[PDB]
Amino acid sequence: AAEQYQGAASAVDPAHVVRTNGAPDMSESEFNEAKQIYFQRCAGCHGVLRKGATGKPLTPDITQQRGQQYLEALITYGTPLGMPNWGSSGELSKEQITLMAKYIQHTPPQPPEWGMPEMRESWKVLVKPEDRPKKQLNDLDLPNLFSVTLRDAGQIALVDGDSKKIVKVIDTGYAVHISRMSASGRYLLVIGRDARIDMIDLWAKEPTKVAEIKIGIEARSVESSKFKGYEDRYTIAGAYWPPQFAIMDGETLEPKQIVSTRGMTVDTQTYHPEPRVAAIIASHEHPEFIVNVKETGKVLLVNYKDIDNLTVTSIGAAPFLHDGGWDSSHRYFMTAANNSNKVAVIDSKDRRLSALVDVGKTPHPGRGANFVHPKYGPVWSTSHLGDGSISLIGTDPKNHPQYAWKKVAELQGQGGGSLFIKTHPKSSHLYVDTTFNPDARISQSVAVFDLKNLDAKYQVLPIAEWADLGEGAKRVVQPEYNKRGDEVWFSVWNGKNDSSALVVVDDKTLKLKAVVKDPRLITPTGKFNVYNTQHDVY
Amino acid sequence: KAAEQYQGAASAVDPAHVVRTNGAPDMSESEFNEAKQIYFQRCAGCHGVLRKGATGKPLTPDITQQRGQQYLEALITYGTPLGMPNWGSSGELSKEQITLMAKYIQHTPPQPPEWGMPEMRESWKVLVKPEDRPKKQLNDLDLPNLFSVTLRDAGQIALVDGDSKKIVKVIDTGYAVHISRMSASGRYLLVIGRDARIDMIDLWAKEPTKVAEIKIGIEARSVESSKFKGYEDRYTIAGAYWPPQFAIMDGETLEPKQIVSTRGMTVDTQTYHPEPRVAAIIASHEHPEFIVNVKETGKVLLVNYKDIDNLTVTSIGAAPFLHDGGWDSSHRYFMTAANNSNKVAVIDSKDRRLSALVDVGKTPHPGRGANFVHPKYGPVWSTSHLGDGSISLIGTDPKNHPQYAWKKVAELQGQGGGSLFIKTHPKSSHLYVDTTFNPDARISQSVAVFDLKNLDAKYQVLPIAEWADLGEGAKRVVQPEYNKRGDEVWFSVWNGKNDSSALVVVDDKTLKLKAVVKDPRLITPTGKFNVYNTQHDVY
Numbered sequence A: 001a002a003e004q005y006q007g008a009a010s011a012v013d014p015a016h017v018v019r020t021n022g023a024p025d026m027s028e029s030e031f032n033e034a035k036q037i038y039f040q041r042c043a044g045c046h047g048v049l050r051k052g053a054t055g056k057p058l059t060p061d062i063t064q065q066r067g068q069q070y071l072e073a074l075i076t077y078g079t080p081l082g083m084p085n086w087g088s089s090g091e092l093s094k095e096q097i098t099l100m101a102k103y104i105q106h107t108p109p110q111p112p113e114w115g116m117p118e119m120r121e122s123w124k125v126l127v128k129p130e131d132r133p134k135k136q137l138n139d140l141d142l143p144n145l146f147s148v149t150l151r152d153a154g155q156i157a158l159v160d161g162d163s164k165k166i167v168k169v170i171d172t173g174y175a176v177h178i179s180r181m182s183a184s185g186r187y188l189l190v191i192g193r194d195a196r197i198d199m200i201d202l203w204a205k206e207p208t209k210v211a212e213i214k215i216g217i218e219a220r221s222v223e224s225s226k227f228k229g230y231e232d233r234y235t236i237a238g239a240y241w242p243p244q245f246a247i248m249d250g251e252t253l254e255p256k257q258i259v260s261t262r263g264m265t266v267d268t269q270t271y272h273p274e275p276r277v278a279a280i281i282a283s284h285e286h287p288e289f290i291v292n293v294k295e296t297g298k299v300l301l302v303n304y305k306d307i308d309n310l311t312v313t314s315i316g317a318a319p320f321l322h323d324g325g326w327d328s329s330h331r332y333f334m335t336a337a338n339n340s341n342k343v344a345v346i347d348s349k350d351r352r353l354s355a356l357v358d359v360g361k362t363p364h365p366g367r368g369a370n371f372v373h374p375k376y377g378p379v380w381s382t383s384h385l386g387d388g389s390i391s392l393i394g395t396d397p398k399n400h401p402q403y404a405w406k407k408v409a410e411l412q413g414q415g416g417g418s419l420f421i422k423t424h425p426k427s428s429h430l431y432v433d434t435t436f437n438p439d440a441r442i443s444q445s446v447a448v449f450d451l452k453n454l455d456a457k458y459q460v461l462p463i464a465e466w467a468d469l470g471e472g473a474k475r476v477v478q479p480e481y482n483k484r485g486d487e488v489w490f491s492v493w494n495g496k497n498d499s500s501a502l503v504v505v506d507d508k509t510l511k512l513k514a515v516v517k518d519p520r521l522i523t524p525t526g527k528f529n530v531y532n533t534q535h536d537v538y
Numbered sequence B: 001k002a003a004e005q006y007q008g009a010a011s012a013v014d015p016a017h018v019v020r021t022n023g024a025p026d027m028s029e030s031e032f033n034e035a036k037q038i039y040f041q042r043c044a045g046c047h048g049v050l051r052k053g054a055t056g057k058p059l060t061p062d063i064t065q066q067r068g069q070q071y072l073e074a075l076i077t078y079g080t081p082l083g084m085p086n087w088g089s090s091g092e093l094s095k096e097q098i099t100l101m102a103k104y105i106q107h108t109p110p111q112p113p114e115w116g117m118p119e120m121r122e123s124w125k126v127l128v129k130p131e132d133r134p135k136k137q138l139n140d141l142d143l144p145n146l147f148s149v150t151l152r153d154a155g156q157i158a159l160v161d162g163d164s165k166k167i168v169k170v171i172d173t174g175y176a177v178h179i180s181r182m183s184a185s186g187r188y189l190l191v192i193g194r195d196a197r198i199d200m201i202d203l204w205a206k207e208p209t210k211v212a213e214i215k216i217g218i219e220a221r222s223v224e225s226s227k228f229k230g231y232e233d234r235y236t237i238a239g240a241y242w243p244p245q246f247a248i249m250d251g252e253t254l255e256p257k258q259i260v261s262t263r264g265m266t267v268d269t270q271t272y273h274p275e276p277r278v279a280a281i282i283a284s285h286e287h288p289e290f291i292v293n294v295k296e297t298g299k300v301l302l303v304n305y306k307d308i309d310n311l312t313v314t315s316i317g318a319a320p321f322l323h324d325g326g327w328d329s330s331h332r333y334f335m336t337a338a339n340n341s342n343k344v345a346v347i348d349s350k351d352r353r354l355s356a357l358v359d360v361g362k363t364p365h366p367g368r369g370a371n372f373v374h375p376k377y378g379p380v381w382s383t384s385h386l387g388d389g390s391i392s393l394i395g396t397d398p399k400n401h402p403q404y405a406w407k408k409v410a411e412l413q414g415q416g417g418g419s420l421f422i423k424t425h426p427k428s429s430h431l432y433v434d435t436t437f438n439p440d441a442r443i444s445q446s447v448a449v450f451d452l453k454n455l456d457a458k459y460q461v462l463p464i465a466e467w468a469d470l471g472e473g474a475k476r477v478v479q480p481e482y483n484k485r486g487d488e489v490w491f492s493v494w495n496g497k498n499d500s501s502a503l504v505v506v507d508d509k510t511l512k513l514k515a516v517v518k519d520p521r522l523i524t525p526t527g528k529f530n531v532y533n534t535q536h537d538v539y
């Protein structure tokens, strides 16, 4: 009966369902050799399913159309639009480039999914809530503590701000991307690019891990609920693969909900198989999380008032959403759609897109830099990877409606390859790095502007040279203030077999203050001051 | 080059864990395509396009290669007592074809095309602009008593006059229209074919005519209109089987506005499902929302249309295999069937939460259900089943009958399994139940009728197809439907395409034959929707 009920023909026409191949035959060792190169060298931009970069996707319909020789030449010489040259540079051999061309003509191999069973299997409560201290069992000045990422070591070091000494090094997931604080200021949350999250109790005799869990195969962001009456309630994390985000117990990390970001794009409104989750930021206006979904250019407002029945408001922005942060008032999310060269303004109160501001080539603000301009009122700034400009955008609809969501002015730095711009309420300086600048000297130093005289050109602080480290690229990255706002820290991100350091500068004088060296300080990248991260002070 | 080095590091994904699919038995183009044709003609309905639609293990290469050729040929040949038919023992397919199917399912599932906004707009057509349409009714038809009947294989629908029992107009639509729905103004009739083609019909024109059309997917089943106060003819939503999505369009022109993906995590295992088909869709009267049923993931979505630019969706978890359903007497609780889970999920449309999960019989199939006041239990909603001959009566009054609310308060027994629709009306003391897919010809060609005033008495069997006087063919009777005044119930005698069919009208007051609708154009009549009863949810 039920077999006759569901027994008619599918409305889908067999003639339009296509079998995939006609690709160059390659053995198992040849396919694995190419596959290994693809995730080590290509995937980052192009993605798992090869639809992550601008331009045409590397799926068999397009690649077989181009042909073996077209592909080999394209991989060999690259393009001026963001596709590196692998043959000319001499990175890959002609035998490898040949394998790569044949490889992308085959259906993309499939990485495993990662749901609730996998999540729970990896979930570990190391110290039960009840077995945790009721008070701070140490003498540490937690607010002024710095959570520094020792990238290649798969660890993080807690550095005491005033003493400049490493208080504790902790094993974490590989290459931790960011550190975030719980609203109470007690727990420290870190997540590795391997999607493994680690919750750390700063009140323990020695700050230690109390729980851990893996939320995907690849990830970048984590965050805690910051709405009033929700301290340490929920923790969210966004993954690159699978395309999803997960919500967990903010006290134990127990997985509760998992949502897929696979969907329709904002621009063409077509289906995208891999919309990776970028930045995530907690709302202060409503009990919701603001999630950035890259490839589809959507900003989702995930309400956690009722975790059992999840309500999500999908706001369209612009393609390629990445990093971003609050305006001075903590109401408007200033996030960059890098490859679209725009900054999306999300109103967290009224819950809508306030504007799409045209900025420079490939905006990369991190969380951005907020400061009051002598003429244009309160602005939010961002530097770029594509060029040497710095965009100042008005963020005061109330008192400065004429300058709101407008690129009010522009500043010029040392050049492109910039990654982070920084300032502080108590500071009158504006720092900007240039980490990926092709020039060694430029990439090994930072620019500083005088907020009291913006017409004047920037000064150049020789960070890497001050560290006195010897050989290596010595790339300087991310300025970060201490709780007081009179010290600015920088990482001298050198190789793993080289010597790296953390340089500190007296903000009041712009003079070298201290240098943090230690054999354990391996490949330091992101630094997050506890109080400043927790209270979004930027 | 700065941004190129920025995004230059390795992916956190281990190449060794990214797998290449193969190790399937070789098969040429001729072979592969032949198996594929059989797959979508015979297997897809249950198993889905990507082969994860049925209960039990999926037919994906990881599992199929594990079982192997032999195991697979054997299972396909004899089937299983759990819903998998026998294709060899019944002589449906040959051993040659079965060997092909066993080889086919060991390969990666061929991919059907996606259907986005560009494809949708391309298909979109405004046949008659809102400005060019009538300002009032230009015909003298009794629109509320009109029946929109589906002439399935014909790729058409027929509007039949309730009182005169005649076909007023025959309209070309998408292939095999599955359901008909009325807009909140009672002016526009909407129909959607299994091919995802929707047709909007203006009942006010001199002769009812199509004003707009669109194709929202490759395969579909449902369409629905906004019914919240102040949104008459504002929006139209349609759900698809492939791709896994629904589409919100302009209610006056059918212009595509938003397309949302239903691919996601399941309610039970909370794992990823690549093909969560959209089933029933009902419009809320409590909030400006559309209640959408997502089958495989067992999710009921409340899509708020108060602002379609920034879509807000509340995802309520219910139970796997959500299919059909309808409102309770008060129009607040959405009583929906999770057929393969043998349960009925109750969705409070006001408080927007899962009110309960009621345990019922084997494979519930309520259609929109049947509501009536039980002498002992108060207001109840009822459903019949495909898996058995039972009829579940569930209490739907938590306010004044909490002792019974959301409980399978009582049961009734019909002719047997294979039931598709149960039905009644506020003005009627009778309760009909068909048996369309019952393996017995006599039972499948008749309908059971209960007495609401004496629920202890056994039903009377009405010989609907025999009354028709049609001759040869299966002559399956399906879906009872009352008229505007609820004094006559209509049935469909769904006979073959090359055979003779009819609509049989029965006097509700006397349970006697009242009329028989026959017409050469009345080919494979299936669903029938009375304009008034459909539009105002009278059931």
Ligand code: DHE
Pocket: A044, A151, A175, A176, A177, A178, A220, A221, A222, A277, A278, A279, A280, A281, A322, A323, A324, A366, A367, A477, A478, A525, A526, A527, B006, B007, B008, B009, B010
């Ligand atoms: C989505 C995302 C965020 C926002 C998180 C948030 O706010 O919740 C972010 C922030 C960050 C932040 C946060 C700083 C802040 O002030 O908020 C830091 C320090 C950082 C160190 C790096 N990032 Fe980041 N980053 C990516 C992704 C992201 N980076 C990439 O996918 C990319 C382009 C390529 C990659 O190799 O991962 C990339 C490269 C880098 C680097 O090269 C850095 C310097 C070193 C590393 O570990 O790869 N990213």
Ligand code: DHE
Pocket: A005, A006, A007, A008, A009, B045, B152, B176, B177, B178, B179, B194, B221, B222, B223, B278, B279, B280, B281, B282, B323, B324, B325, B367, B368, B478, B479, B526, B527, B528
């Ligand atoms: C999701 C869904 C609904 C609810 C929509 C709503 O109300 O929003 C529905 C309702 C319906 C309704 C609604 C009646 C009502 O009173 O609301 C009718 C008449 C109907 C005629 C048929 N349906 Fe239906 N039906 C399916 C799906 C559905 N059918 C299938 O997938 C299935 C099992 C397989 C198929 O072949 O499509 C199926 C078979 C059938 C039939 O065999 C029928 C009799 C004829 C046909 O064309 O296939 N279905």
Ligand code: HEC
Pocket: A037, A038, A041, A042, A043, A044, A045, A046, A053, A054, A055, A056, A057, A058, A062, A063, A066, A071, A074, A075, A079, A080, A081, A082, A083, A084, A086, A100, A104, B003, B004, B005, B007, B008
């Ligand atoms: C980002 C830093 C990239 C890396 C690493 C690699 N590719 Fe790329 N690729 C990138 C972009 C932005 C584009 C578009 C370029 C344009 O001018 O349109 C491309 C393009 C290709 C193509 C050509 C696609 C086509 O037009 O048919 C191919 C074949 C290609 N890329 C291959 C590829 C391989 C094999 C790589 C790793 C060894 C690789 N790309 C890395 C960005 C990035």
Ligand code: HEC
Pocket: A002, A003, A004, A006, A007, B038, B039, B042, B043, B044, B045, B046, B047, B054, B055, B056, B057, B058, B059, B063, B064, B067, B072, B075, B076, B080, B081, B082, B083, B084, B085, B087, B101, B105
């Ligand atoms: C629904 C009316 C079905 C149709 C039409 C077909 N199949 Fe099916 N199949 C269905 C169910 C409910 C199940 C579960 C059976 C069980 O006892 O668990 C199955 C199972 C299969 C399997 C076996 C899967 C396994 O355990 O490894 C196979 C190989 C299979 N079905 C094949 C198949 C083919 C090729 C069909 C069309 C020619 C087909 N099925 C139709 C439901 C239904």
